[PDB]
Design a protein around this ligand. Sequence first.
Ligand SMILES: OC[C@H]1O[C@@H](O[C@H]2[C@H](O)[C@@H](O)[C@H](O[C@H]3[C@H](O)[C@@H](O)[C@H](O[C@H]4[C@H](O)[C@@H](O)[C@H](O[C@H]5[C@H](O)[C@@H](O)[C@H](O)O[C@@H]5CO)O[C@@H]4CO)O[C@@H]3CO)O[C@@H]2CO)[C@H](O)[C@@H](O)[C@@H]1O
Length: 304
Amino acid sequence: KVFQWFGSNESGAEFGSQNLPGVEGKDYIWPDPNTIDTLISKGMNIFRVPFMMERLVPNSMTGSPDPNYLADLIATVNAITQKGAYAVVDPHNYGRYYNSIISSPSDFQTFWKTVASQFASNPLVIFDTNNQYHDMDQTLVLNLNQAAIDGIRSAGATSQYIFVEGNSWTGAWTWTNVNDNMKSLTDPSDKIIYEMHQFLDSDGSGTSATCVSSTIGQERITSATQWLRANGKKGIIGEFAGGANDVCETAITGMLDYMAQNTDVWTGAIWWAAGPWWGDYIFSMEPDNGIAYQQILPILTPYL
Ligand SMILES: OC[C@H]1O[C@@H](O[C@H]2[C@H](O)[C@@H](O)[C@H](O[C@H]3[C@H](O)[C@@H](O)[C@H](O[C@H]4[C@H](O)[C@@H](O)[C@H](O[C@H]5[C@H](O)[C@@H](O)[C@H](O)O[C@@H]5CO)O[C@@H]4CO)O[C@@H]3CO)O[C@@H]2CO)[C@H](O)[C@@H](O)[C@@H]1O
């Protein structure tokens, strides 16, 4: 394979986020192991699983898990790792809990000890401290990532990689402008990976199928690449997408071709997104009829 990791997000458990706790099968749904198997057979080896902190550990993040939501997270993780692929456990929470900024590193560390304890023996689990920190204090983002690492390792989960995320929605293109302080994170296992996201539409929000230009992806990750190299760090693109059109196709392959010549720092890339409730979503990687599964996956072949 070209990269250490190449795969897809498996979205759904974080859906309908305005309904807390919400109802499984009505507001949210978990990934389908059968279609995960199909993506595994195509050569993908990493699957990132968004979920809501409030659904896994309700009311207070220092409390006990919700049995039913945890049982389905466990089932999803095991469905991925039993085959030999990596499962990224992603509290898809934007640095916020019940829509308030998480300002207690100690509370966050307890949450992460609770979560890591469920997976501590599984070396194919990857812990992702939180999805897309944004519009919050830059020192707090550093300290939350460090508290997560401390909680994870305190649970005896020492074999696993930890994906840390930065401010500005962990964007690659904005990384050096705001996230330099993230270089000081420490891990006794030395398995920190800096997870950045990069979309290709004009404002980088990943909501339009139109890409700025055929080179916009490779352009948007060059300064992040040099930041990783200058600081002796490793990175991954944890979310990326583009529409099913010629300009985006070229932007996607140009970005991945650049990463492929910079694997001293880039460990790989994760598409946004697959999952069973995307329907006609412009970026759906869900077999067998998602638009990206049909029209984008053929151009990802050389990286599988
Ligand atoms: O039996 C069917 C069942 O359906 C229930 O209703 C479903 C409905 O069928 C679905 O269409 C709907 O799906 C929406 C989700 O609720 C919503 O959470 C999801 O949000 C997406 C968003 O569309 C997408 O843009 C977003 O990308 C953000 C990422 O999170 C960022 O990381 C990245 O930067 O890019 C974008 C930036 O915006 O992701 C979120 C998900 O994280 O959109 C779905 C529509 O595409 O779900 C309904 C349930 O909530 C019905 O209620 C039941 O009765 C019925 O049984």
